[PDB]
Amino acid sequence: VNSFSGYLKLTDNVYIKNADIVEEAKKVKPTVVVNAANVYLKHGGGVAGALNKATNNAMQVESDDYIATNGPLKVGGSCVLSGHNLAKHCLHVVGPNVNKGEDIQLLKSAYENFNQHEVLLAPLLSAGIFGADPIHSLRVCVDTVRTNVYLAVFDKNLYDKLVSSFL
Numbered sequence: 001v002n003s004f005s006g007y008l009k010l011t012d013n014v015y016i017k018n019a020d021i022v023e024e025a026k027k028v029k030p031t032v033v034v035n036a037a038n039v040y041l042k043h044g045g046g047v048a049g050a051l052n053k054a055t056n057n058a059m060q061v062e063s064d065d066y067i068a069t070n071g072p073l074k075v076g077g078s079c080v081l082s083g084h085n086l087a088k089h090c091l092h093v094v095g096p097n098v099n100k101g102e103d104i105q106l107l108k109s110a111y112e113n114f115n116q117h118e119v120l121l122a123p124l125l126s127a128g129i130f131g132a133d134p135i136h137s138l139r140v141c142v143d144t145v146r147t148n149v150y151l152a153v154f155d156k157n158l159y160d161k162l163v164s165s166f167l
């Protein structure tokens with residue numbers, strides 16, 4: 001039993017809610033919240049901009065130190081950093097950005113990072129300003145993630161389309 005409430009069950013291990021990931025993280029304080037990161041951990045917009053804003057830019061400060069020490073992530077890769085006021089940990093995961101011309105096949109590799117964590121609050125990878133088809137992202141999620149994932153979708157219109165098209 002966990003504290004995630006108001007989720008539709010899609011499969012044995014995948015759940016989906018119409019919720020702002022920022023507010024869901026603040027409410028639940030999950031062990032892991034996933035960020036829709038880029039390789040430079042520059043949290044300017046989309047999910048990342050919103051999560052970082054909610055940390056009062058502390059996520060960005062921590063991220064800049066991480067990059068100065070370690071260099072950029074790989075597309076499809078991830079790192080674990082602090083969750084600040086939102087979660088114990090933040091798993092920064094880099095899905096491919098279609099608007100940069102990046103390989104959509106890397107989406108499966110990106111979701112594989114979730115399997116290193118027993119339970120996660122997450123957005124759909126490569127959705128929104130990353131330019132992928134969110135229905136495809138949900139399919140890859142369900143077919144790749146084996147741990148317990150709670151997906152938060154802000155847009156009600158999108159959420160209903162995701163539910164109504166799910167096989």
Ligand SMILES: CC(=O)Nc1ncc(S(=O)(=O)NC(=O)C2(c3ccc(Cl)c(Cl)c3)CCC2)s1
Nearest residue numbers: 020021022046047050123128152153154155158
């Ligand atoms: C604060 C914040 O951004 N919180 C998020 N939680 C979850 C998400 S998301 O990754 O599911 N993206 C979305 O819902 C979209 C969206 C459409 C319209 C608006 Cl107004 C917003 Cl904010 C987001 C982008 C693709 C639909 S963004």
